[PDB]
């Protein structure tokens, strides 16, 4: 089984690009990160920052997770993000996504030793 930390990396980290360069970014990335394997993951955010910069959020602004738990942290600064969301028509196994690039704060749930991101809660 994948570790919670490795699963966060695979689903949320895109340190290789500064931003989504086309409308097809999400179709490509949802596929290459194995988020369309058995079903279409409806919503997924990729972060265009270093792994170190995203891990560092776990010692930034402590906030509530939307589930009401208290191991969530908001980034002090904005980050380059891409929101991926299934289109209204999308049907497995022809998953189709809308790509939205933005600069926003990220909120992540952190856990473990080392204390690292295990869930992407939201971007603000
Ligand atoms: Cl790991
Ligand atoms: Cl995988
Ligand atoms: Cl997400
Ligand atoms: Cl958690």
From Swiss-Prot:
The chain holds residues 27 to 150 of 150 of the full protein. This is Ribonuclease pancreatic. Its EC number is 4.6.1.18. The keyword Membrane does not apply. Glycans are attached at residues 1, 7, 34, 37, 41. It is an enzyme of class 4 (lyase). The active site is at 12 (proton acceptor), 119 (proton donor). The gene is RNASE1. Interacts with and forms tight 1:1 complexes with RNH1. Dimerization of two such complexes may occur. Interaction with RNH1 inhibits this protein. Monomer. One of its GO terms (molecular function) is ribonuclease A activity. GO terms for biological process: defense response to Gram-positive bacterium. Endonuclease that catalyzes the cleavage of RNA on the 3' side of pyrimidine nucleotides. Acts on single-stranded and double-stranded RNA. Disulfide bonds join 26-84, 40-95, 58-110, 65-72. The keyword DNA-binding does not apply. Belongs to the pancreatic ribonuclease family. One of its GO terms (cellular component) is extracellular region. Pancreas. It comes from Bos taurus. It comes from the Eukaryota.
């Amino acid at each position: 089984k994948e570790t919670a930390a490795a699963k966060f990396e695979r689903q949320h980290m895109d340190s290789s690009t500064s931003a989504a360069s086309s409308s097809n970014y999400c179709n490509q990335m949802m596929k290459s990160r194995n988020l369309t394997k058995d079903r279409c993951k409806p919503v997924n955010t990729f972060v265009h920052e270093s792994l170190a910069d995203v891990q560092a959020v776990c010692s930034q602004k402590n906030v509530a997770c939307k589930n009401g738990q208290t191991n969530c942290y908001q980034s002090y600064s904005t980050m380059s993000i891409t929101d991926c969301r299934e289109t209204g028509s999308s049907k497995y196994p022809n998953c189709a996504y809308k790509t939205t690039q933005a600069n926003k704060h990220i909120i992540v749930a952190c856990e473990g030793n080392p204390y690292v991101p295990v869930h992407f809660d939201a971007s603000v």
